[PDB]
Amino acid sequence: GHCIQVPPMATEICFSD
Numbered sequence: 001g002h003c004i005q006v007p008p009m010a011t012e013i014c015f016s017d
Helices: none
Strands: 003-005 012-014
């Protein structure tokens, strides 16, 4: 249930936790 935002705007890493 974790997520992070990074460049470019279209780039977010969502984990399983």
